[model samples]
Target: GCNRLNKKCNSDADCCANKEKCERPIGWKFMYCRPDVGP
Candidate 1:
């Protein structure tokens, strides 16, 4: 699964592993996983 943010990520391992980078985007308070692209 990807992060709630729009940033590109592989899985929770990459985000959860590094909370500092996993947290919500700058200016945003909520922490979410990045969204996936539709093709």
Candidate 2:
């Protein structure tokens, strides 16, 4: 499972790998690993 906001966030690298930037009413932050995308 992914760490919650404000937690150590595993490490800066993990956060970077998950982090995303988008245009929306509210900015979004990636905090979880990408889904397995496999059966």
Candidate 3:
């Protein structure tokens, strides 16, 4: 295996597919995902 598995915490601004961004969701302290990325 050449992929990073079981990793969901990225405090650093990196590893975002499709030029997306990593952000912690609102009303949460540890929930994050690719928010609405569009024009």
Model 3 alpha-carbon miss at residue 32, Å = 2.2
**Which sections of candidate 1 miss by over 4 Å?**
1-22, 35-39
TM-score, every prediction:
0.29, 0.18, 0.36
- Per-residue accuracy of model 1 over 13-33 as CA lDDT, tens digit each: 555343324346689765545
Query: Which pairs of residues have clashing backbones in candidate 2?
Result: none
- TM-score result, candidate 3: 0.36
Over 4 Å off, model 3: 1-7, 12-14, 35-39
Model 3, position 3: C-alpha lDDT score: 26
CA lDDT of each candidate? 0.47, 0.35, 0.46
Better of 2 and 3 by TM-score: 3
lDDT of 2 by residue, 1-39 (tens): 544333333344543234421212236453433322234
RMSD to native for every prediction?
Answer: 8.4, 7.9, 4.8
Pairwise lDDT winner, candidates 1 and 3: 1
Kindly give the stretch of ten consecutive residues in candidate 3 with the minimal lDDT sum: 1-10
Error of 1 at 30 (Å): 0.7
Q: How far out, in Å, is residue 33 in model 3?
A: 3.0
